[PDB]
């Protein structure tokens, strides 16, 4: 014989607070991991672009110097 719904209310609130905090912590960690991984992706990708840029630059110059040496 449960007289009051006071204990029901306490179980509902406690469950809701614990659940909510767990969702917040989980979402925060999942996004933090994703952003960290993406950061590594972007650094690698940018290194590729820089490398390709430097090569084409040094090359455009070496194609000029080569042309010269052959003449005459």
């Amino acid at each position: 014989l449960v007289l009051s719904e006071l204990s029901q209310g306490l179980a509902v609130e406690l469950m809701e607070r614990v659940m909510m905090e767990f969702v917040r912590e989980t979402c925060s960690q999942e996004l933090k991991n994703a952003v960290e991984t993406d950061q590594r992706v972007r650094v690698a990708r940018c290194c590729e672009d820089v490398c390709a840029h430097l090569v084409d630059l040094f090359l455009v110059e070496e194609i000029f110097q080569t042309a010269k040496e052959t003449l005459q």
């Binding site: 006071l6 306490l10 969702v23 999942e30 996004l31 994703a34 993406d38």
Partner: protein, 91 residues
């Protein structure tokens, strides 16, 4: 009455019972795979919205409703029983 709820909550806290129940609740939710479900849902929302747009507030807003609905009624039944046992022994 809220004054009663405040009195009980204070007791749960100082007796360490609230912290203890919280620990066991979290452990049960992890055990049953509830937390893995949250993470799976996060992955999909991230992929859908994009890291260039999504924030933590966005994720929580999107994931919470389903999270709340997937809390097993079994753990809620056990929790309620623990609360009643606690009230009976401290009042």
């Amino acid at each position: 009455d809220a004054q009663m709820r405040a009195a009980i909550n204070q007791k749960l806290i100082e007796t360490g019972e609230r912290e203890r129940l919280k620990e066991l609740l979290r452990a049960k939710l992890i055990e049953c795979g509830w937390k893995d479900q949250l993470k799976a849902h996060c992955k999909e929302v991230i992929k859908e919205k994009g890291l260039e747009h999504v924030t933590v507030d966005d994720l929580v807003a999107e994931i919470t409703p389903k999270g709340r609905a997937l809390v097993p009624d079994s753990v809620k039944k056990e929790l309620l029983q623990r609360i009643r046992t606690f009230l009976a022994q401290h009042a």
